[PDB]
């Protein structure tokens, strides 16, 4: 048999993850006649991972709670693997252990995902957690600027006319 070298690392993690979720749903469902329409829990699993990378919520309605929370623990497992490889060989391509082009062009993508989802978490927590600046803390800045500008006699900028010279 053949080992798992560096070119089939990613094509073996999916294989063993879906083998594990296969014979977890095979031993978790009760004595009903059909199991998963022969494949459908796996389709929900991969859709859950695609919605994880895209930060779409994946609230599928009408799903049994044991299979929906086993999909949640398996996609948290795969997201741990994915981001903990992203950290690792981002630091390797930082100090320069590897020059691999697949790794560099792949870890630019596995890190734009991370920035953009951290960014919509902080844009979402701007709205529900109020402005991070207080009323007094902003009125002070505003009053300070109008004092500076009137001490400078700064005439404000007019909107440009259509017959503006320059």
């Amino acid at each position: 048999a053949k080992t798992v070298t560096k070119q089939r690392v990613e094509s073996h993690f999916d294989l063993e993850l879906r083998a594990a979720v296969m014979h977890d749903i095979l031993d978790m469902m009760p004595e009903g006649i059909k199991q998963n329409k022969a494949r459908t829990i796996l389709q929900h699993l991969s859709e859950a991972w695609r919605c994880w990378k895209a930060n779409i919520p994946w609230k599928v309605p009408g799903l049994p709670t044991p299979i929906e929370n086993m999909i949640l623990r398996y996609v948290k497992a795969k997201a741990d693997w994915w981001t903990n490889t992203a950290h690792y060989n981002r630091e390797r391509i930082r100090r320069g252990a590897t020059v691999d082009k697949t790794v560099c062009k792949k870890n630019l993508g596995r890190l734009t995902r991370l920035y953009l989802k951290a960014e919509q978490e902080r844009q979402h927590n701007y709205l529900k957690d109020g402005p991070y600046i207080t009323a007094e803390e902003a009125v002070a800045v505003y009053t300070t600027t109008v004092h500076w500008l009137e001490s400078r006699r700064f005439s404000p900028i007019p909107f440009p006319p259509l017959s503006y010279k320059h």
């Binding site: 981001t83 903990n84 950290h87 981002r90 890190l111 991370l114 920035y115 989802k117 951290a118 978490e121």
Partner: peptide, 16 residues
């Protein structure tokens, strides 16, 4: 929760 861990916070403020 690996996006909220402080290691990922310091990673994602050091590099980007």
């Amino acid at each position: 929760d690996t996006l909220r861990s402080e290691f990922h916070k310091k990673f994602m403020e050091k590099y980007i």
